[PDB]
């Protein structure tokens, strides 16, 4: 098939009689034989450019400081919070008493109950740190 003659960085338009044409600026083709140059990803707002796009590779983003990546290729950004907090639709909210979060992301989780395994409390828990159990 003639379109296989077009390497990455070019495209084989099935219109205009399948000629290899170079990818216009701000577009790319990461593989040969493509029928169109894909639009280069743009990192705006919560997203930040990690690598600019070339004729043969898409641009890559990470998250602006204060946000963290989720999904393959950092396809999503989620807002950070501080330790002792969790993210809600209304913003960062402090952990409930008896729960904690030791990360800048994720949800709070309850303190370990030492008694349930015949253990005692060596260090009381905080909103940032779990209870420490001893024998």
């Amino acid at each position, epitope marked *: 098939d003639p379109c296989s003659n077009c390497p990455a960085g070019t495209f084989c338009d099935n219109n205009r009689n399948q000629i290899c044409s170079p990818c216009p600026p701000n577009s790319f083709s990461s593989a040969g034989g493509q029928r169109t140059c894909d639009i280069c990803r743009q990192c705006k707002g919560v997203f930040r450019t990690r690598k600019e796009c070339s004729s043969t590779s898409n641009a890559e983003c990470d998250c602006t400081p204060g946000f963290h990546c989720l999904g393959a290729g950092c*396809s999503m950004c989620e807002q950070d919070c501080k330790q002792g907090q969790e993210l809600t639709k209304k913003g960062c909210k402090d952990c409930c008493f008896g729960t904690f979060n030791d990360q800048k992301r*994720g949800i709070c989780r309850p303190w370990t109950n030492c008694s349930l395994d015949g253990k005692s409390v060596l260090v009381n828990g905080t909103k940032e740190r779990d209870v420490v159990c001893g024998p």
Partner: antibody
Amino acid sequence: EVQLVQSGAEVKKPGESLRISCKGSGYSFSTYWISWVRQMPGKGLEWMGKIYPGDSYTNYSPSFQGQVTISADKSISTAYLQWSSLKASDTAMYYCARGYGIFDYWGQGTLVTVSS
Amino acid sequence: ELTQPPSVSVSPGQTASITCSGDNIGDQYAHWYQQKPGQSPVLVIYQDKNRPSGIPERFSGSNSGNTATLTISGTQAMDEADYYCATYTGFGSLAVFGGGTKLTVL
């Protein structure tokens, strides 16, 4: 790349116990929740529960509380879902996923067929 | 409980609207997953309206009151799939999937 790889298909009889697994790779396994999701044939997704593998804290949805056990071995970046006694109605696809409300990675699924 | 219509059908190019209703679901973040036959679910909308990069821009979402809505403008045959809404509730730390909607395209 980040990957969640689940164990292969299982064929069991009612009354047998079973544990299936989900191995995460390419990221810090101890610091992301692992959720387990059931999908009976032709039915919808059902959240069963989740585990924080760093300290193995687990919680379950009310309809699966006491019916299954979720566990983890963080030294091998593996999460587990286990039954003490399977029923024929447990026949389903079971997915592991990373997260607690946003599931940004999914395993390929494990088919469990329970037939007398 | 999150309730979805079991079926939505459209012709190619028509707008597909998939609802997910729950009491005060507008107070939560709603996320939308797409699942094709034989495949694992894929997140197409997160935090009610945000689309992951790589998802076709014809996918959009909204959430207010007791209803969250996934909208596909100019629906294509490749969009035929099962669609599931999901929310997380901090009161009990539970995730809940809607019952699912099978989108068929003529």
